[PDB]
Each structure stands twice: as C-alpha cells, then as structure tokens.
Amino acid sequence: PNHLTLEQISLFKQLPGYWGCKDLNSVFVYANQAYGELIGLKRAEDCIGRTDFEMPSPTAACAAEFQQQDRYVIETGHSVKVLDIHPYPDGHWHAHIFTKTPWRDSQGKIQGTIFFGQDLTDTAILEVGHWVCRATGLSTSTTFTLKLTARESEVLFLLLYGKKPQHIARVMGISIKTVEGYEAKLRSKFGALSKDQLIDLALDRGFGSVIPKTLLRKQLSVVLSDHT
Amino acid sequence: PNHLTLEQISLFKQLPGYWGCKDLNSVFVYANQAYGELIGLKRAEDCIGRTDFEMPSPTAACAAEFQQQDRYVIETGHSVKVLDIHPYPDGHWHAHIFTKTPWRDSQGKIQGTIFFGQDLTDTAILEVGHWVCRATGLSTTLKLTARESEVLFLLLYGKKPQHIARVMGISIKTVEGYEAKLRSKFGALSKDQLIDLALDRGFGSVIPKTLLRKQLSVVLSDHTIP
DNA sequence: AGGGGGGAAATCCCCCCT
DNA sequence: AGGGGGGATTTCCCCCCT
C-alpha cells in the first residue's frame, strides 16, 4: 500500500503527544500541530527546515542538549527517553518525557531522529510499583477537590518517593518536627489515618506522576538510563 | 496539504509505540506494525475487523476491560491512562501504559478511540523524581539474583520492610539477608546510599518480570482534553 | 506558620544459623 | 532460596510551645 486511506490519515493528524522528525543535522522535517503550538507556532509546518535553536520558545536555550541527544541516537542506533522541564511560550512550565528513536530510510540506514513527547501527566512513575505490590491478594478496578500549599506539595512529593523524615528535614532546611507537622496536615487533607494510608490515597489520586509547580524552576533535559 | 509526502508516510509507519484506533464498537480500524507483532499478528492489517476478543494473545482475557475503558472515552471525551500487565505471544510478561483518547471525524463527532501504548518493562521512568531533586537542590558489572532484583525494585519505590515482606511472602529477616547482599555488590554503606547508587546505575528503569504474575488492566487517571 | 516531648513501634545493620 | 538476636537509632503520632 503506497497510500494511506483518508481515515488512516486522520489518525496521523490525531495521534496524541508532541512529535515529529529531524534529519542527520537535527533540522526539522515534520512536526505535528500539537508540537507546533507547544513551541509557539500557529502553523506547525513553519517548523520544517528549522533547528531547535531557531524556535520562538525558551526551549531554544537547551537546543544544544537536544542535538547532543539526537547525535547519540543517530550514532548508537539505541533509542532513549528524555525528561524535559522547560518554560513555554504559553507562559507556563511543562514537564515532558521525549522518546527519541532512529528514523530509518527505505533500506534501513539511519537518516535522522524521531521524537515523541508525552505530557508527564499521561505517564506513570510511582503508580507502577504501587500496582505491582497490589498483585498480592485481590483489588478492584473502578475509576472515579483538594488544595495543597507549596511546602505541603514538596513534602508529599518526597514522601511518595520513599524519602524518610531525616532526609526530608535536611533537604528542606527545616526541623524534623516541622516535617511531622506537614505529614499531619497532609494526613488530614487526604482523610488518612496513618502515613502508610496517606501514601495509598495520594497515589490513587495521581500524585505519583505529579511534579509540584514549586519544583518546575530550572530547565532540564536529561536522558534517563535504561539497560538497553 | 491534503496529501502527506511519502517521507511523512515513513514517519507514520515508524512512529514509536503500540498504537491504532477502533470504531464505536471497539472493532480495530488500524493498528501499527509494532502493535500487530506484540499481539501475534506478523502483518498488522490482520487486526482490522477484529475485536480485542479475537486477537491471538492471552490479552484477550481482559478484552472486556479494554472495551469498558473504550466506552468511557467515547462517553466522556476524556483521555484515559491505563496500566496494563499481561503475558504476550512472545512468551513474556510486559507492562505497558496505554493512553486512550477520542477518535473524531470531520465534524468533530466521536467515532471511536485512539490507543497509544508504551512499554516500560525495561524503560521505567522512576529516576524522574531523583532528577527533579538534584536539579532543585533537594538531594545529596553487576549481576543480581531474581529475588534480589525484587527487593531492589521495592526499595527504589520507597516500600518499607514490613511492606516488602508482606508483598514477597517472606519474613523481614529474609528481607535483610537480601538488602545486605545488595549493599555488598553495589558497594553501598547504607540502605540510603544503595538506593541512590542503584538509581544512578539505571535500575529505576527495570521492572522485574518475576513480579508480573497476574493480568491487570486498570485505569490510573483521566483528564480533560483542552 | 516553625519547633518540640515522649513513648510504643519500627527501622537499620552488626552478628548468628539451615 | 529461607530463617534470627539484639541493640543503637528513627519513625510514628498523639499531645504541646512560640
């Protein structure tokens, strides 16, 4: 089939995420509309023939890291997953996970890079171990407000990753008794009786893949290590 | 631009992930090459016209959960995040996150669902939390047995000894003659340093498939599409 | 807000076994 | 693979102080 039917082409324009491809020079060959608007372009085709340096977004300050990641995918043939935290022309900070894989020509030779970004909230981090543990006994599956202060959010964040009170008190510059007060305030807001129950309720309400706004402070583009 | 160029079509066939779409009845309209192979169809066109019940895969045992999630997307218009744990015709257990969104038509009416799955059995992104801590100033060859890998996985996700013992069906004393051996071959002096070191060796990406023993298809969350 | 006392319970990590 | 003993050190969660 040298052609896609028109309904399949509608899938092309509707797939989720922020994605496209670049050639061996990391100059854009195609970007979808989602990525175009995220990077500040009403017409996603204006990305074509631009590099990451030439885009009207604060992400251009990280263009070198993107290209370094692209060169690694191109030379090694391995695919990678990148954590990205940046401010965007819409005025807010966003965290993404960008998958990067070799883009191959009609005969298998590498001709560039394919990127695919997902918003962090469409990904799973701590909910993975939360549910692997639940496979002992039997649970049930049925899907279904609350406001936290800046420090309440940071403490919850560190709790869900298993950081102990001695660790949390050191990294936040406060007393261990101060942390206990925040665990109590969090235990109250979630309607939890114990700390272990607080962890459970918070993971069920999505906090396992939430980075609190107060920690979207510095631009970052790191390749997360995998074992091939 | 009512036509894609042929190189834009090459991107369509190579886009990463396991994805495709289904109509209002959850009958497969399209499935990409990666998904067809994951399910057991060497040629993905064979997916078309089938439902989740009719796939040559043990995942067909959860087809009703799939269609339930499908109907929820059709009903609400939300995007839905599903955790999936299943055995597949390649003889292995896998852990995927499938994202499901409405599939719309020319006038915007919902005509089915789009699924998009990513394998994280060996590409888990746990290290995200560690990277956020370091960048914000809130932080400071190996061969493992199957049982050691389990304990390490549970430590990396912050589980406590009582929790790890209950999960693994052994005593805490045994979950110590394991943390001890992990502390050794990682060269860590404290359980804290073992977590940090292992995270930097990339073990946050691993899900020990010895812990993948029951099929699971559960909705983790959903959200509005702006 | 940030910091604290105190006591039951749990952890951490040394040592010991089949 | 699966178990402990024991003791220094911390959680844990109820009170409480500026």
Ligand SMILES: Cc1cnc(O)c(C)n1
């Ligand atoms: C936001 C972002 C991060 N990495 C990339 O490679 C691109 C193209 N965009």
Ligand SMILES: Cc1cnc(O)c(C)n1
């Ligand atoms: C493996 C899998 C899980 N959920 C789905 O909806 C599909 C189509 N496949």
